[PDB]
Structures are given as structure tokens and as C-alpha cells.
């Protein structure tokens, strides 16, 4: 599966299992950016890039914070205003979770995008 | 029935005892007729009817019991047999099957919930001693399609096997607009 | 006399007491309609098998 | 007005195919749908300046029955 989806699936499951850590094999820049958002949000602990001299590896420290996470496909574009519809579909629990969107500004949470008045493409969700 | 044997007139005393029982079983039924003991001497019969409801036997100020003896004397002892009569009460009707059947019968005559009447009656006879009890109403319960309601408590089902269990048995009929309902009631007393 | 089956005469055809059939009258029972009536209600009048 | 299209046919008086491309209107659908129309742009009087070029066509008094005139080539 796609690298980002793959990374999100592993983290989700390892989180479920209760594992303390997970290693994500494809380590794209996008993935790292995605992880930073999750981190700022308190969804995951520290993570580091390990240089395999290949794709690279991401060691992610699992907190037990995540209920579920995954990639949103396709990555639908969204207007500055357009987020509400998506929160309803992606975040089953009201007042919980965030949408990770990619904006020209960079990858960030929907909440930041909204404050920014930026639209973008939706990469994933975490709650 | 306790009497010294008599080779000559066993025939006469035994038919006579039976004849007396016949009236007692019919005329005294709404009383809790639970037993008629008989004793004898020359030309004198004791006879005691045991009943739950003595007053029903006696009659107001003892009028009916007087009718009984006189009517009964007609059956036999044309010359002065001078058959006596007595009425002892049966302590606690809850123990008497005969009465219990009547209770249930009565309620169903009235139109009470048969299921309820069974449970309560099985409760009461159980409540006052009894090893076990069972009631069965048949006929068309509640005037619906015919069935039989059960209910039991304690030894009963098993107690039927033991001979000389000494289970008190009774039956009552029940007149309804709809039709008759038999009620049967078993009370398990000690084997002895 | 009474025992004698023949009757010099009798006042009234009678009928049985219970019902009233004329024939089958027996002075004793009074069941004129028939002895049968008497037989059925043996209990009614003191009589023995 | 002003249009952009590809020169589909050099052979004759020239013609350019203007294309419109749009994403399907409803989401859950991303069908990239293309639509196109042909305008006989007088590619040019005799310059024959412009197959395969993507030119811009401008509205003009009628150059020919079919035609718009070729404003300029976006890119070959």
C-alpha cells in the first residue's frame, strides 16, 4: 500500500496492541511531516529517522494516545470553510481528533489551517 | 372403621358403614368432609365426621346436625339403632386436600386467574407444613381453549411412586358458564 | 280384591302420576303411564330391588 | 474572445481544437473529463506560421467562413 497509508496502519495497530514502539519502513519527507503534526498534537511520542542508506526508517514511540488513525483517500481538496463536512465523516467522536491536511504552507492540522484561512488536501485523520 | 369382627353380620355392619359413608360424602360435601370414622357396639354406632367447616355440618344453633341424625337413622337402625353423631373440626384446612380443591374450585367459579389460584393454594398448603403439594386445574382455563395448568412444590412427583406415602387427595368440580373445570389437589404428608 | 288382577270396576281411567299414560297403570305405584316410569324412579318411592 | 487550442489540421485552411478539461462535478468522482470544439482559425493568411502547435485564437472580423485568427503560439 502507499507509504503514508502503510505508516498510519502500522502505528494504528501497534497502538492497539499496546506496543511501545513501531518502526515504519518507507520514510518519506511527507511521512515525517505527518508525524510532526501527530507529535505536536500529543498523539505520539518521540520519533527519529534512522539512516538505512535506503528509504530510511522512522522509529516512532507509541503513547497509547491514539484510538485510531489512517490515510484519507483520495486526498480530497478542501476550502478554508470546507473542513466541517470532513470532520463529521473522519472523526466519529465530536470534540476529538484532528485532520491532517497539506497546504501550500506545509502539512498541518485542520485547526491550524483554519486559523490560517488556508485550504488544502486531506492526508489523514487521528483521534 | 374399628369394630370387633362378627362372623354372622360382618355383611350387615360393613354394608351399613358403607351406606352411612354414602350420605356423609354427599350431604356433608361443602364442609371439608375429610374422613368418617365409625365405631360399633351392639346396636350403637358412634360415627364422627371430621370437617374443616363444622358450622356447615351443625347448622344454625345446631338445626342441620339434628336433621342428619334423624335422616340417617332412617337408612338403618329402624328399631332404635340410636346411631350417634359427632362433628370434630380438622385443624388447619391448608392440610386438607379436599378443602384445597374447593378453594381453587371456588375462585375459578368466581372468575379468578387460575394460574394465580394454583400458585397461592400450592403456597398455602406448603406454608403450613406439608412435605409437598400439587394442584392441577384442567378444562378450558379462563374460558380460552382447553388445557391443564400445573403447579407443585416439594415431594409430590417423586411421592406418587412410594405406596403408603399418605398423600391426601382431593378433587373439586367447577360449574362455569363455559363448562366444567376439574381441580385436583395432592398434599404430601409424612410417609407414616 | 286388590290382589286379584281383574277389577270389578275402577273409578277413573287415571293416568300415571308422573306423566300420565293411561296404560301400564299399577295401583300401587300409581304410575299408570307405565311401570317403566316407576322403575326409573325406584328411589322416588321406597321399594326394594 | 480569446481561445487556446491545438492545431489539429495543417492540411487545408488551418483549424485549431479548443479543449476544455474539467474534473467531475461531484466528489467521490475525480474523473478528469475533457471536452473540445474546433474553430477554423485562419491560422494565417500565408505565413503558414503554425501541426501540434498550441496557439491562441482571437475573435476577428471573419477571415473565412469557418474562421477567429491565430493570435500567437503558446508553445510548439
Amino acid at each position: 500500500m502507499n507509504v503514508l497509508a502503510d505508516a498510519l496502519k502500522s502505528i494504528n495497530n501497534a497502538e492497539k496492541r499496546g506496543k511501545r514502539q513501531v518502526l515504519i519502513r518507507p520514510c518519506s519527507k511527507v511521512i515525517v511531516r505527518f508525524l510532526t503534526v501527530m507529535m505536536k498534537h500529543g498523539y505520539i511520542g518521540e520519533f527519529e529517522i534512522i539512516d538505512d542508506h535506503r528509504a530510511g526508517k522512522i522509529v516512532v514511540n507509541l503513547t497509547g494516545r491514539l484510538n485510531k488513525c489512517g490515510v484519507i483517500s483520495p486526498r480530497f481538496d478542501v476550502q478554508l470553510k470546507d473542513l466541517e463536512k470532513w470532520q463529521n465523516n473522519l472523526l466519529p467522536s465530536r470534540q476529538f481528533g484532528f485532520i491532517v491536511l497539506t497546504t501550500s504552507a506545509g502539512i498541518m492540522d485542520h485547526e491550524e489551517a483554519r486559523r490560517k484561512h488556508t485550504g488544502g488536501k486531506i492526508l489523514g485523520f487521528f483521534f | 372403621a374399628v369394630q370387633i369382627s362378627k362372623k354372622r353380620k360382618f355383611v350387615a355392619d360393613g354394608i351399613f358403614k358403607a351406606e352411612l359413608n354414602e350420605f356423609l360424602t354427599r350431604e356433608l360435601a361443602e364442609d371439608g368432609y375429610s374422613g368418617v370414622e365409625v365405631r360399633v357396639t351392639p346396636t350403637r354406632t358412634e360415627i364422627i365426621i371430621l370437617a374443616t367447616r363444622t358450622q356447615n355440618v351443625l347448622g344454625e344453633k345446631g338445626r342441620r346436625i339434628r336433621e342428619l341424625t334423624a335422616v340417617v337413622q332412617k337408612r338403618f337402625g329402624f328399631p332404635e339403632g340410636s346411631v350417634e353423631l359427632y362433628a370434630e373440626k380438622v385443624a388447619t384446612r391448608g392440610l386438607c386436600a379436599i378443602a384445597q380443591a374447593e378453594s381453587l374450585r371456588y375462585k375459578l367459579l368466581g372468575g379468578l386467574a387460575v394460574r394465580r389460584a394454583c400458585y397461592g393454594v400450592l403456597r398455602f398448603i406448603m406454608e403450613s407444613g406439608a412435605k409437598g403439594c400439587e394442584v392441577v386445574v384442567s378444562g378450558k382455563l379462563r374460558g380460552q381453549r382447553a388445557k391443564s395448568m400445573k403447579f407443585v412444590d416439594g415431594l409430590m412427583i417423586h411421592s406418587g411412586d412410594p405406596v403408603n406415602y399418605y398423600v391426601d387427595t382431593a378433587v373439586r368440580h367447577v360449574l362455569l358458564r363455559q363448562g366444567v373445570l376439574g381441580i385436583k389437589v395432592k398434599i404430601m404428608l409424612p410417609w407414616d | 280384591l286388590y290382589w286379584s288382577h281383574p277389577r270389578k270396576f275402577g273409578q277413573g281411567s287415571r293416568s300415571c302420576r308422573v306423566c300420565s299414560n293411561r296404560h301400564g297403570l299399577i295401583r300401587k305405584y300409581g304410575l299408570n303411564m307405565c311401570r317403566q316410569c316407576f322403575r326409573q324412579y325406584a328411589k322416588d318411592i321406597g321399594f326394594i330391588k | 474572445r480569446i481561445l487556446s487550442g491545438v492545431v489539429t489540421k495543417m492540411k487545408m485552411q488551418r483549424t485549431i481544437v479548443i479543449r476544455r478539461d474539467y474534473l467531475h462535478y461531484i466528489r467521490k468522482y475525480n474523473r478528469f473529463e475533457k471536452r473540445h470544439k474546433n474553430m477554423s482559425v485562419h491560422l494565417s493568411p500565408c505565413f503558414r506560421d503554425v501541426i501540434g502547435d498550441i496557439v491562441t485564437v482571437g475573435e476577428c472580423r471573419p477571415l473565412s467562413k469557418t474562421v477567429f485568427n491565430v493570435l500567437k503560439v503558446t508553445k510548439a
Partner: protein, 97 residues
């Protein structure tokens, strides 16, 4: 010389009674022949349950075991005084000849 024939449906009632008859009579005169058991007749009685009967097969079946006792007394009226005075069981019918 009086023969006492005691009969009863119940054995105990007789055993009790006959015993009294001996003990009392024991004093007033002779020792008495001594209560004798005698064989027990068994009666089978089939009688129509209902008075209509008349052949109706309603005849229930009953059997009565009739027990007997001799304890013959041979001796004077004082012995008799002892008897009239005390009586007990109704279950037993006494025949004095």
C-alpha cells in the same frame, strides 16, 4: 362357665381388650382359660356400590379380617361384677354366653 368371644377388625384393639378381660376376671374368680387367639376368618365382600345395583357391576371389593379370642371364664358372678364395671374399646364387640 362363661365363654367370652371377642372379635374385632383391629388386632390391637382386641389384644388390649381381651387382656383386660383376663386381668379383671383373674381376681374375682378363676384364672380363666386364658385368651386364645383362634384363627382369623377373612371375608371378601362384593356389594353393589349403588343401591340401584341390581346386577349393575358397581360392586366394589372389600375384605375384612375378623380376629377372634376365646379367653373362656369358668367361675362366679363376682367375676361378672368385674366386667360390667369397666369397659373400654369400641372396636371390639364382646359376646358373652
Amino acid at each position: 362357665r362363661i365363654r367370652i368371644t371377642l372379635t374385632s377388625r383391629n388386632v390391637k384393639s382386641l389384644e388390649k381388650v381381651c387382656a383386660d378381660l383376663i386381668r379383671g376376671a383373674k381376681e374375682k374368680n378363676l384364672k380363666v382359660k386364658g385368651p386364645v387367639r383362634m384363627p382369623t376368618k377373612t371375608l371378601r365382600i362384593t356389594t353393589r356400590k349403588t343401591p340401584c345395583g341390581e346386577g349393575s357391576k358397581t360392586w366394589d371389593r372389600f375384605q375384612m379380617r375378623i380376629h377372634k379370642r376365646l379367653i373362656d371364664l369358668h367361675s362366679p358372678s363376682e367375676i361378672v361384677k368385674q366386667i360390667t364395671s369397666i369397659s373400654i374399646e369400641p372396636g371390639v364387640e364382646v359376646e358373652v354366653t
